[PDB]
Enzyme design. Structure first.
Site, PDB file in Angstrom:
ATOM      1  N   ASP A  77       6.268  76.596  35.709  1.00 41.52           N
ATOM      2  CA  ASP A  77       5.637  75.246  35.760  1.00 41.52           C
ATOM      3  C   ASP A  77       6.083  74.567  37.068  1.00 41.52           C
ATOM      4  OD1 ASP A  77       6.987  72.640  35.372  1.00 41.52           O
ATOM      5  OD2 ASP A  77       5.830  72.315  33.546  1.00 41.52           O
ATOM      6  N   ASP A  88       9.520  73.633  31.215  1.00 43.16           N
ATOM      7  CA  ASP A  88      10.482  72.604  30.710  1.00 43.16           C
ATOM      8  C   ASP A  88       9.784  71.413  30.013  1.00 43.16           C
ATOM      9  OD1 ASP A  88       9.596  71.627  33.366  1.00 43.16           O
ATOM     10  OD2 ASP A  88      10.908  69.967  32.779  1.00 43.16           O
ATOM     11  N   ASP A 108       3.924  73.111  28.032  1.00 45.67           N
ATOM     12  CA  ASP A 108       4.240  74.571  28.051  1.00 45.67           C
ATOM     13  C   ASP A 108       4.574  75.105  26.643  1.00 45.67           C
ATOM     14  OD1 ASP A 108       5.680  72.984  30.405  1.00 45.67           O
ATOM     15  OD2 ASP A 108       4.660  74.701  31.316  1.00 45.67           O
TER      16      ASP A 108
HETATM   17  N1  LIG Z   1       2.090  58.774  32.650  1.00 50.80           N
HETATM   18  C1  LIG Z   1       0.959  59.304  33.103  1.00 50.80           C
HETATM   19  N2  LIG Z   1      -0.211  58.629  32.932  1.00 50.80           N
HETATM   20  C2  LIG Z   1      -1.342  59.191  33.399  1.00 50.80           C
HETATM   21  N3  LIG Z   1      -1.506  60.359  34.029  1.00 50.80           N
HETATM   22  C3  LIG Z   1      -0.331  61.011  34.176  1.00 50.80           C
HETATM   23  C4  LIG Z   1       0.909  60.557  33.751  1.00 50.80           C
HETATM   24  N4  LIG Z   1       1.897  61.471  34.062  1.00 50.80           N
HETATM   25  C5  LIG Z   1       1.254  62.444  34.649  1.00 50.80           C
HETATM   26  N5  LIG Z   1      -0.106  62.235  34.763  1.00 50.80           N
HETATM   27  C6  LIG Z   1      -1.131  63.100  35.354  1.00 50.80           C
HETATM   28  O1  LIG Z   1      -1.884  63.667  34.307  1.00 50.80           O
HETATM   29  C7  LIG Z   1      -2.315  65.008  34.658  1.00 50.80           C
HETATM   30  C8  LIG Z   1      -1.882  65.970  33.576  1.00 50.80           C
HETATM   31  O2  LIG Z   1      -0.427  66.100  33.553  1.00 50.80           O
HETATM   32  P1  LIG Z   1       0.282  67.349  32.815  1.00 50.80           P
HETATM   33  O3  LIG Z   1       1.378  66.860  31.928  1.00 50.80           O
HETATM   34  O4  LIG Z   1      -0.731  68.289  32.259  1.00 50.80           O
HETATM   35  O5  LIG Z   1       0.952  68.116  34.048  1.00 50.80           O
HETATM   36  P2  LIG Z   1       1.937  67.613  35.179  1.00 50.80           P
HETATM   37  O6  LIG Z   1       1.192  66.802  36.196  1.00 50.80           O
HETATM   38  O7  LIG Z   1       3.124  66.934  34.554  1.00 50.80           O
HETATM   39  C9  LIG Z   1       2.454  69.095  36.087  1.00 50.80           C
HETATM   40  P3  LIG Z   1       3.288  70.333  35.086  1.00 50.80           P
HETATM   41  O8  LIG Z   1       2.190  71.156  34.457  1.00 50.80           O
HETATM   42  O9  LIG Z   1       4.130  71.129  36.051  1.00 50.80           O
HETATM   43  O10 LIG Z   1       4.136  69.628  34.062  1.00 50.80           O
HETATM   44  C10 LIG Z   1      -1.763  65.283  36.066  1.00 50.80           C
HETATM   45  O11 LIG Z   1      -2.745  65.098  37.077  1.00 50.80           O
HETATM   46  C11 LIG Z   1      -0.611  64.279  36.173  1.00 50.80           C
HETATM   47  O12 LIG Z   1      -0.292  63.894  37.492  1.00 50.80           O
HETATM   48 MG   LIG Z   2       6.862  69.599  33.263  1.00 49.94          MG
END
Ligand SMILES: Nc1ncnc2c1ncn2[C@@H]1O[C@H](COP(=O)(O)OP(=O)(O)CP(=O)(O)O)[C@@H](O)[C@H]1O
Ligand SMILES: [Mg+2]
Length: 959
Positions: free
Chosen positions: A334, A664, A668
């Site tokens: 991730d 983490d 996932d």
């Molecule tokens: N508090 C929040 N409110 C709205 N959108 C958010 C948010 N926190 C993250 N996002 C966005 O929502 C989308 C989905 O996030 P998701 O949890 O699936 O992955 P992530 O961006 O945390 C990367 P990873 O898969 O490595 O955890 C992403 O484009 C992210 O930037």
């Molecule tokens: Mg994460």
């Protein structure tokens, strides 16, 4: 008449029906429903000790060993029987401890009980019951720091809960009141209004209601916390288990056992010993071939590796999976909180004057009062802990950047009131009316906010740039939005877009708050793009370079934008600067248009493929034939929904790749469970979220999980191959004696089996892993040509020295020939027994040292320490005894030999055999290439990934 599943009983329940269930009946309904469902208790059976023993003793080996003890007692070799029982006793004790420990960890997690306040249809009882909680019970939740017993939809109020154990999610999760509706959908199907069993409640507050009240859905330990513990009990198997391949190798030994038995029958028939007596000799020959200390030795391997990992911090469950670690071919990772660093500085915000974007403000504080400031301050779902604010690292860093401060505990449906900084060169403090939570699949969050100005209420939506820009009415959306965002994503700044809509509702009214999530997130005006900065964890860059060097491919699976994931990937070394990255893109098949797949290269200063989540959606549904080609060539899977991450795991698995997951996050959780080796890097102690929980927040875990696995797989193969070598070395020794005057030993056999072999076998399993992960994968079939060759060639050398010894002994000029007129138990001293035992004793030890072969997967033998001391000690005792048995002569039944010369000849033969054994194993390692080249010049693997790779090498994807 016919039993119905509890899920089947409560699958079609209406949104309204969950509210109908709220204020359920106090007792009569409770009792009948509780009787039908069964008691709300974890189903781990509790055993005093003897309860376990009866079940434990049913193993088939235990029966054979019990029969053997009786047989050896009938032969009157009591001492060998005394050992055979004792070794089985150690086996059963260690198996009992192993089994007891594995259950105890799981039982300790689920051993929690507390008094619960339960709501009557016209009542509000306190601390009434817990284990008897009614399947449809409605309860008032505790104010602060309260564990939730059952999976219950929240009917009224809002809850802040820690779900760290359940979802791998340390950060606090907001919970909200369910909306009654004609439609039936499950609380789990909502996946948000439900409050999950065994999850701590940080705080519980009802804006309008007197207190937070929840109605139980799926319960009785068979869902959520228990649903996963229940998974750990009677766990899912691994296909094509290597023990089957070892069982085939046992059949090769079974031929030798039969051949030995017929050889014995001819010898006994020639000897003219009584037929009744010959049966006992044949039975002894079969029982000797069975190894007594093998079943224990297999347990001690795993228990030592669990011990090795517990000290490293990589807390493990299903210890059989540690070997599976050894074989893993690709490790999925991730982006945020694993490959990068959790916690991110806000690198300013970009505002838009009209359609056009204005230049970026470095510090969000210096901006005009109006929509963007209010949205930046109010969009988060942060709550106030004791003298602090708690929220998602992104949302927390944003609000601290604004400088606005959250108000404390002190209207009706008014919550999380936002106080201004109150520095001027208008303060206008703003209050949230409706909060919408963020779901990884949904990819946005929303709030409705009102101010003392008392205008039309404004709805603010913070989310993923593409989805938010798409959701916005194309009035404010800039022509070059994509190109401008591309600057920020290509730089590697995590970007979230904020959109504002003025909402035509009555301000500061509870009733007015009630709204459709889609209607709030419908027509929108793009306001600004946040520019969050996440930086690479120092150790990530190293581990990925080693995993790529070993040729275990690293795939990146992320919910973030493809360009940011490409920048992180290019940074870590998923994609090296020499390598070329292609962005597979797909157009949706709809109206008059069929499905189109367009491949566009990216150029920056092994044909790696990067695919957005939607493209992968079209590829799986509408290009099934192409999916094998992309999934065997794809390194940076991006914009993926939580469900999509499971699909990459499952498709990569069906292509015969051994997947691994080091995520983490809650996103996932699905993929971690589905994957062969799943590691949750942020969890504390053992957890049900992943098979192999860690407490170190880095990728440095993953090399250690592989390195130990390869050691455990080589230890399992070494201990098996040494146990075979010992049994055949015993077979040759006992037979040499059976031909020659029908003799054996009693106290001698206890000494060899109990001290020489059992001590060496347990102690050889604690060497520990090699320092550096290696190119060569650990050998995976016990019935291999090298292993079979090595065992057969060594046994020839064993016999050579053993026979050589007897010829030398008989040839000795002082030698007195043995009587050979009387039964083996009756002839307590035999001159041959002295020589054959004395030569064989040392060679049993030597086998372990030659077998160890500690280099590619294990550290050098000396590093073990307890083994090395025991090897030297037992060797010294044996050297001492063979030169001068003294007192021990009597117990050993040894025939005293005065001549020094023959003793030195005997020591010489053991030294020669020892040199021989070491030479043979070194020769075996060196000989393998020549053997392999001649036996097979070229071959093609049945596994699909190795073929698809080879095809792609012959003809690439269109360049
Ligand atoms: N508090 C929040 N409110 C709205 N959108 C958010 C948010 N926190 C993250 N996002 C966005 O929502 C989308 C989905 O996030 P998701 O949890 O699936 O992955 P992530 O961006 O945390 C990367 P990873 O898969 O490595 O955890 C992403 O484009 C992210 O930037
Ligand atoms: Mg994460």
């Amino acid at each position: 008449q016919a039993f119905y599943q509890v899920s089947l009983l409560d699958h079609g329940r209406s949104c309204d029906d969950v509210h109908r269930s709220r204020h359920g009946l106090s007792l009569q309904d409770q009792m009948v429903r509780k009787a039908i469902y069964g008691p709300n208790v974890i189903s781990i059976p509790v055993k005093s000790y003897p309860q376990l023993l009866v079940d434990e003793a049913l193993n088939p080996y235990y029966g054979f060993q019990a029969f053997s003890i009786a047989l050896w007692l009938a032969d009157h070799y009591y001492w060998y029987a005394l050992c055979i029982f004792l070794i089985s006793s150690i086996s059963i004790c260690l198996s009992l401890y192993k089994t007891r420990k594995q259950s105890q960890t799981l039982r300790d997690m689920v051993k929690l009980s507390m008094r619960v306040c339960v709501c009557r249809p016209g009542g509000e009882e306190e601390w009434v019951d817990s284990s008897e909680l009614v399947p449809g019970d409605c309860l008032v939740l505790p104010q602060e720091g309260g564990l939730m017993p059952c999976d219950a939809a929240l009917v009224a109020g809002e809850c802040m809960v820690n779900e760290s154990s359940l979802t791998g999610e340390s950060i606090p999760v907001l919970k909200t009141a369910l909306p009654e509706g004609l439609g039936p959908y499950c609380a789990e199907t909502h996946r948000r209004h439900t409050l999950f069993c065994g999850t701590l409640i940080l705080q519980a507050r009802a804006y309008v209601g007197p207190h937070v009240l929840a109605v139980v859905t799926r319960t009785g330990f068979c869902t959520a916390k228990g649903g996963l513990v229940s998974s750990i009990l009677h766990p899912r198997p691994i296909n094509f288990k290597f023990y089957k391949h070892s069982m085939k190798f046992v059949a090769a030994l079974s031929v030798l056992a039969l051949l030995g038995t017929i050889y014995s029958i001819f010898i006994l028939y020639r000897n003219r010993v009584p037929l009744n007596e010959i049966v006992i000799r044949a039975l002894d020959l079969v029982t000797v071939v069975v190894p007594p200390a093998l079943p224990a030795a297999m347990t001690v391997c795993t228990l030592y590796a669990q011990s090795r990992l517990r000290r490293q911090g990589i807390f493990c469950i299903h210890p059989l999976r540690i070997n599976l670690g050894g074989k893993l071919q690709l490790v999925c990772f991730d982006k945020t909180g694993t490959l990068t660093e959790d916690g991110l500085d806000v690198m300013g915000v970009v505002p838009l004057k009209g359609q056009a974007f204005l230049p970026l403000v470095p510090e969000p504080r210096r901006l005009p009062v109006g929509p963007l400031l209010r949205a930046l301050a109010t969009c988060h779902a942060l709550s106030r802990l004791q003298d602090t604010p708690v929220g998602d690292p992104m949302d927390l860093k944003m609000v601290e950047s604004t400088g606005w401060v959250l108000e404390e505990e002190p209207g009706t449906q008014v919550l999380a009131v936002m106080r201004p900084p109150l520095w001027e060169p208008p303060p206008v403090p703003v209050s949230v009316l409706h909060r919408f939570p963020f779901s990884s699949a949904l990819q946005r969050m929303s709030v409705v906010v009102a101010w003392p100005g008392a205008t039309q209420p404004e709805a603010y939506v913070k989310g993923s740039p593409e989805l938010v820009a798409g959701l916005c009415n194309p009035e404010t959306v800039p022509t070059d939005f994509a190109q401008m965002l591309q600057s920020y994503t290509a730089a590697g700044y995590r970007v979230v877009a904020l959109a504002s809509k003025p909402l035509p509702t009555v301000p500061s009214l509870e009733a007015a708050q009630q709204l459709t999530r889609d209607t709030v997130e419908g027509d929108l005006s793009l306001l600004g793009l946040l520019v969050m900065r996440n930086l690479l964890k120092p150790q990530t860059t190293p581990v990925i370079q080693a995993l790529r060097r070993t040729r275990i491919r690293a795939v990146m699976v992320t919910g973030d934008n493809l360009q940011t994931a490409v920048t992180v990937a290019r940074g870590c070394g998923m994609v090296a600067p020499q390598e070329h990255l292609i962005i597979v893109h797909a157009t949706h098949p709809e109206r008059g248009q069929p499905a189109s797949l367009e491949f566009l290269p990216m150029e920056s200063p092994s044909r790696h493929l990067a695919l957005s989540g939607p493209t992968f959606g079209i590829i799986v549904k509408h290009f099934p034939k192409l999916l094998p080609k992309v999934l065997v060539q794809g390194t940076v899977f991006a914009r993926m929904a939580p469900e999509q991450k499971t699909e990459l795991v499952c498709e990569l698995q069906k292509l015969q790749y051994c997947v691994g997951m080091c995520g983490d996050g809650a996103n996932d959780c699905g993929a971690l469970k589905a994957a062969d080796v799943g590691i949750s890097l942020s969890q504390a102690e053992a957890s049900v979220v992943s098979p192999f929980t860690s407490s170190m927040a880095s990728i440095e875990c993953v090399p250690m999980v592989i390195r130990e696995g390869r050691c455990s797989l080589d230890t399992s193969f070494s201990v098996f191959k040494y146990m075979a070598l010992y049994s055949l070395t015993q077979f040759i020794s006992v037979l040499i004696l059976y031909t020659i005057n029908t003799n054996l030993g009693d106290l001698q056999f206890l000494a060899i089996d109990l001290v020489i072999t059992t001590t060496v076998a347990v102690l050889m399993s604690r060497t520990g892993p090699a320092l550096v992960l290696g190119r060569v994968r650990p050998p995976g079939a016990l019935l291999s040509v090298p292993v079979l060759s090595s065992l057969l060639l060594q046994m020839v050398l064993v016999t050579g020295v053993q026979l050589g010894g007897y010829f030398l002994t008989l040839a000795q000029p002082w030698f007195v020939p043995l009587n050979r007129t009387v039964a083996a138990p009756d002839n307590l001293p035999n001159y041959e027994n002295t020589v054959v035992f004395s030569l064989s004793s040392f060679q049993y030890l030597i086998l372990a040292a030659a077998v160890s072969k500690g280099a590619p997967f294990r550290r050098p033998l000396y590093t073990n320490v307890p083994f090395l001391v025991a090897l030297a000690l037992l060797s010294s005792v044996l050297v001492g005894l063979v030169l001068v048995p003294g007192l021990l002569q009597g117990p050993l039944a040894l025939r005293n030999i005065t001549d020094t010369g023959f003793k030195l000849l005997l020591l010489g033969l053991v030294t020669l055999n020892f040199v021989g054994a070491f030479m043979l194993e070194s020769v075996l390692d060196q000989c393998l290439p020549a053997c392999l080249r001649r036996l097979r010049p070229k071959r093609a693997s049945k596994k699909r990934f190795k073929q698809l790779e080879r095809e792609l090498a012959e003809q690439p994807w269109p360049p």
